Amino acid sequence: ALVVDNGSGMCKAGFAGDDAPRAVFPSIVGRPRHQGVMVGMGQKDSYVGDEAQSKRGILTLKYPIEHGIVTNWDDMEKIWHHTFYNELRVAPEEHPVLLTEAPLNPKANREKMTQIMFETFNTPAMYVAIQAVLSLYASGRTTGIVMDSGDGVTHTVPIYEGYALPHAILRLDLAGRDLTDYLMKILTERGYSFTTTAEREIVRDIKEKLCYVALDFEQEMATAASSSSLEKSYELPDGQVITIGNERFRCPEALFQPSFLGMESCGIHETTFNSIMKCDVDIRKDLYANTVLSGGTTMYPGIADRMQKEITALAPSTMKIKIIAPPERKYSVWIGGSILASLSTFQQMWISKQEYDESGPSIVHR
Amino acid sequence: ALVVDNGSGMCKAGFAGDDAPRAVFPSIVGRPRHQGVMVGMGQKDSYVGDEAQSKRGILTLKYPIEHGIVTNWDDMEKIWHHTFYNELRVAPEEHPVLLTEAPLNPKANREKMTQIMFETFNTPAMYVAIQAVLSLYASGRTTGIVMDSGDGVTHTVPIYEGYALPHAILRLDLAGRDLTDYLMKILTERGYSFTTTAEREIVRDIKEKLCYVALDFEQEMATAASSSSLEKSYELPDGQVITIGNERFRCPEALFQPSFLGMESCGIHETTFNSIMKCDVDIRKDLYANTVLSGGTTMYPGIADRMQKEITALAPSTMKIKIIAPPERKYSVWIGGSILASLSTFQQMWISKQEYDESGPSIVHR
Amino acid sequence: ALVVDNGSGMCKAGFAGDDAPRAVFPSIVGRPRHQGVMVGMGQKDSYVGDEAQSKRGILTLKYPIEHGIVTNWDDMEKIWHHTFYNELRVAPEEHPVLLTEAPLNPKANREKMTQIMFETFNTPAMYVAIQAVLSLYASGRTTGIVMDSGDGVTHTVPIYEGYALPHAILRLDLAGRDLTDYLMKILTERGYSFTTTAEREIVRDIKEKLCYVALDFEQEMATAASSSSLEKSYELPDGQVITIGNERFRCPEALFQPSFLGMESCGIHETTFNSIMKCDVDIRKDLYANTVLSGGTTMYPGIADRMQKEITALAPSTMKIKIIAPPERKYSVWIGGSILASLSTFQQMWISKQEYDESGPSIVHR
Ligand SMILES: Nc1ncnc2c1ncn2[C@@H]1O[C@H](COP(=O)(O)OP(=O)(O)O)[C@@H](O)[C@H]1O
Ligand SMILES: Nc1ncnc2c1ncn2[C@@H]1O[C@H](COP(=O)(O)OP(=O)(O)O)[C@@H](O)[C@H]1O
């Protein structure tokens, strides 16, 4: 059977019988912005991400998912069309599929999602699972608190002996692009300017390479305020050199104390302590030492030490805390998806065509 | 033969050929309270005490006995099923069994109880004995007044030269949970709150460790009202510290003058003097100096001196009084159960299958 | 003399010489969250509710009372300072004061509460009264069971011939914010999102207008699941339309069977019958037909039928039941406060300056 994650900002897909996905691509949809100056087929009406990332410039770019909510289904159908016919070379009527979703999301999302999977692709069977649960599958633990943070969404689920406390789930719409744009805003301080969608991807790729979190914002600010050398140069695709200095960490700092982004909620560490504090007293000691980090926005170096230092300064003393931060976190959700698809006991749970034909899309509520 | 005490709040059991029981556990039944977020067998439909106390949190807790009356036989049967097959590793058709009961209890309780032991477990023989009598076996006396007090029940039986005076027995439903909840009510004075079945057991464990009886309630109140140090800290399972002060003794005080719990009966010492005053005049001098305390709710420090001071101030002078408070009172009842099962003269007293098959359940009255 | 109710979520105050209070406002404290871009005095360091609700947005909001416990005295002092100097234009040395409180609350609350009224405002005299008793004054009955439920607190007191049974009082911390968050949680089903303190008040105002309790949750669920028209539109302050449907009653339902909020206690109707069952038998016929509802969280339409249906299905038959639901329930408590202050016989009960100067703050325990 086939496992697809349409989680925000990049689709990942392959056979469930494997350890890693087969395709990984930006899910961007792009369209031409000028008339044709020379005759030929070369100008197709639309390009999907794996071409859309190459020809970027003459394309505008739109993201069909924002904050984990589909904004334009007609784009998404094109994306799935690419994933099925062009990449995995597989007929979707042959294989069952399961899909990721964010934990809290407008139910209409599920309804149309499964409607498309039946009424167009004629797929045999379907299931929608929340990402944090699947993340636990990849570690193979049965107790812990999962933190996942992707393009535009963060959430946490506490689970104990395989039971979630639904009253304890939180959203926090802080991550991803909402963080990337803060690098756009501050990078204009040095004078470099970046204005447009095709050009935003350069700043994203910088962020993907040259960023880390300070073990104390105050000391590293005082450091870079001194004449000490901490900057690294970067070269733009045109060969313009950039120097970035005093700013590789003042960016991700805004993931904490997020008043920089103007929000006034709690931040990541607050929300990790506040979720456990919605758990019963006798559970708490067991969720500590089992904070699991997940999703690509945890791949900054230094998050582990910062987070443990913060929580240990915030939680009651005498309680040991241990963050399970493996490598390969970028794949963890899909890895867990692969695991669940293989367990034979799960095979009764797929929604059948027969069920959809009685209940229609709302069957997703069982 | 097998010895089981199903007295309130914890079952105690083992072979009669021993000095102590082999298993002692809280007899609580607990059930899951959320739908499953993760696949597996791990969540069985029900847990008996030895797990139900451990995994508490995701469990709610119910007591199948309350105030000494069985509320749901199907729960008790589950408890016995665990005790027989998993714990004592014994086939019930092989061995006789005897059961404790409180002295006054609705007879239907006995009827169904023994019915289950014959018609389901196919046990060879059965006998029901009152707890105070078994308590005397452990001391090996033939004269005295037994005071037993457990979760939710207290009673006294006078026995003289091995004869009880059934017209002099009294119940007083004051002890145990009825006292523990008064710590729940009062502990909120400092501000801490405790609301649910899994969480009540924390207050029970506090009571089991940090409680004592004042050698004069009035002086120790005046003491703790001054800035003298008498409080002890306790750490909760989450590592929250608790401070308890002025209440390690204001709790068990309510076992006397129980107007604190709003009841208006007599208290324990009253009921010990009033029961003896139902004895004939010529018995009294022999019951004095033979008040035997029994049952775990007597395990507070200070009970001995308080009780003797009260009775000696209340009884007529020139009459010697001596409270026999041995150790192992937590086991005293089961010890006495062990003794009676071994006495060869008793071997005629078991109710046979033949008797139940002639008389039916009322055979329990012989 | 002055009557003040600092019950959670809004202060209410005025002269005892009246039928209703003169000022009623949300007691929220709010503070600026950006540096000043324009010159003037207009930005004071802090705003109390009547501006804090108007200018909300540029303010963050904190509630100085939570669950009936003061969290930051320096905030409360700001609220009382406003109520005395700004609103009532009154010197506190002129008039005695009485204060509402919840029935069970950490005694330290009283000590500091009365300390402030003497040592700062130099008021001549003080008394603290529990809200339910004052509620009975407004009806003028002398027998009944009072149910009061306000922002964040519920409690009940049985009173018979002017005597309470303190051992039968219950708290249940279910109401208020704990309900508001359930509207926040469920409203995201339609897709709307609400994240911040200033924005929470919009969801509160929705709750104040478009909500009712179902005479059977099951039938009304099946009804709204059909294509029948039951939704109502609401307009946001920006003119964004909201549609709410199939959810105007699934909110207050969680005030019963509150497992929706993940709590595992009993709910309101259970706890109302269970409090009476701790009363003596001969009182019961008199507490029935005298359940008096009080506090603003009783202002839902439909409460009467649900409550009467529950108790009548639970209580023994042949027993008359009558819910006294007057209008003006939002003021009943304060009305009674005004009454008690007026009875000349009550005029001996105020704690004098002389007593506080001997005993200090703990004099409130007499
Ligand atoms: N090297 C990196 N450093 C920081 N952030 C990264 C890095 N690589 C990827 N990311 C973040 O993670 C995103 C990749 O997709 P992601 O959101 O992890 O998928 P999923 O939604 O499955 O977690 C990127 O858009 C970026 O926001
Ligand atoms: N250390 C302790 N201190 C005070 N009370 C205790 C302690 N241990 C047990 N208890 C009381 O005794 C109960 C244990 O069961 P118990 O009532 O002794 O059984 P039985 O009814 O057969 O006597 C506990 O629920 C508690 O009420």
Ligand SMILES: Nc1ncnc2c1ncn2[C@@H]1O[C@H](COP(=O)(O)OP(=O)(O)O)[C@@H](O)[C@H]1O
């Ligand atoms: N129109 C309304 N509909 C439903 N509930 C309301 C309404 N107005 C007020 N409330 C409830 O009552 C609260 C107002 O304060 P309240 O709790 O009545 O004070 P008190 O604690 O003295 O009763 C609001 O927070 C809200 O919970």
